[PDB]
Design an enzyme around this catalytic site. Structure first.
Site, PDB file in Angstrom:
ATOM      1  N   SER B 144       1.029  -1.300  -0.044  1.00  0.00           N
ATOM      2  CA  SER B 144       0.017  -0.139   0.067  1.00  0.00           C
ATOM      3  C   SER B 144       0.657   1.283  -0.056  1.00  0.00           C
ATOM      4  O   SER B 144       2.096   1.137   0.469  1.00  0.00           O
ATOM      5  CB  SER B 144      -0.869  -0.059   1.028  1.00  0.00           C
ATOM      6  N   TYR B 158      -2.077  -1.413   9.870  1.00  0.00           N
ATOM      7  CA  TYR B 158      -2.173  -1.358   8.624  1.00  0.00           C
ATOM      8  C   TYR B 158      -0.742  -0.979   7.845  1.00  0.00           C
ATOM      9  O   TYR B 158      -0.191  -1.671   7.080  1.00  0.00           O
ATOM     10  CB  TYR B 158      -3.168  -0.787   7.802  1.00  0.00           C
TER      11      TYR B 158
END
Lengths: 234, 234
Positions: B144, B158
């Site tokens: 990401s 995350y």
């Protein structure tokens, strides 16, 4: 933050960088709790301070930073014996490196447990008290320049864990700041004297500096990686 | 590498980016094994291809990527049913975000298990065969831009996991290269049509590109972080 009158809890505190940090924090008025996995290392470390007539301001705890129950117990023992801590140094590490095709699930699990879950466990165990006591604090996590500069595959596990630690530290900054807790990620290379690193960490705690790098030898390799990342962006 | 006549194994393959990658790999001649935790999603994905008379080129497996025994099973089933795979897309993810103060050990364990140990488990279970078959291959890991650009604390878990996947992918490159297996780390932002991402991945596999970023919106914020890191270096 002011180091005078604080207590510092230091994992991997009996050797290397951890011990150098220990020395310089004590020199700046901290009391110490040194945590390490090796009993002999801890006794040697405290003996160093004993010989300098500072034994009463150094406590030792044998600790596996991957053991969450032990970590909670250590936080309670720290508070009881030496107070706080106001300063948490998550510095324990291990090197699971080796030919990547020989790497096992156990290597991954152990490598991540100590190098990544160690700091996470420390944060989980210690921050409830650090927040509640309301006198601020500071958290230093030891990563590595191996978490930033391109590394070869035989260092995959170590690099992966330490990269995570850098981002962990960056990202929790705002949450910790709410309770006047500063954070720093330390990124060493070949360890320059430990007490020199110690003084860099003293500065980072006093002035609330997010990043401390011990060496600049990888400035250009890092820059090259960073440029490649940027070039991938449309 | 040529995609025509290969088999691609795609985790999180039944929706979002994974499904967009699936669509474009099939369009370029790959057979598909789609793995996902949701059986209803897999059925819908299967139906999509069935209605376009591509049914006999798609197989579905319900899979928890954090379950190493299930991953070993999946590698066996993939090879038996569809052959290979030549292309391994480790794309499954989850987001345990929330106020960082309220983070639990379960949040951390779940977040790291799926987002980081998922790709590691895929590598461990699938690459021995990919090496042994001796026809090369490619691995795509979905990270990401959150693993690169500064993120707020409520996204700590995350961000931490995804940063690790970027470094994982970089470091294993030279090991996988030994057996003509290329690697790519995919770094998405807001998902832009999944099929557009799929075509970026086709391009990465064909041209052996290490990095794919889907968005340029975080160029300046990444540059600022990178500069701050560089400035810390003596």
């Amino acid at each position: 933050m002011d180091i005078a009158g604080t207590t510092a809890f230091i994992t991997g505190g009996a050797s290397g960088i951890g011990f150098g940090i220990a020395q310089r924090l004590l020199a700046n008025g901290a009391r110490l709790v040194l945590a390490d996995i090796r009993q002999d290392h801890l006794d040697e470390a405290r003996q160093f301070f004993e010989e300098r007539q500072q034994g009463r301001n150094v406590h030792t705890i044998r600790l596996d930073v991957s053991d969450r129950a032990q970590m909670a117990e250590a936080a309670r023992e720290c508070e009881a014996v030496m107070g706080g801590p106001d300063i948490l140094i998550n510095n324990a590490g291990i090197d699971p490196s080796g030919p990547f095709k020989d790497a096992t699930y156990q290597d991954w699990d152990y490598g991540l447990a100590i190098n990544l879950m160690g700091p996470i466990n420390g944060i989980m165990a210690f921050t409830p008290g650090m927040r509640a006591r309301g006198r601020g604090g500071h958290i230093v996590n030891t990563a590595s320049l191996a978490g930033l500069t391109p590394m070869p595959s035989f260092m995959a596990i170590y690099a992966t864990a330490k990269a995570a630690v850098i981002t962990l530290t960056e990202t929790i900054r705002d949450s910790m700041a709410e309770d006047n807790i500063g954070v720093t990620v330390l990124m060493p290379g070949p360890i320059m004297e430990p007490t020199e690193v110690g003084d860099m960490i003293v500065d980072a705690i006093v002035h609330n500096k997010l990043y401390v790098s011990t060496h600049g030898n990888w400035r250009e390799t890092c820059e090259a990686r960073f440029q490649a990342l940027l070039d991938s962006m449309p």
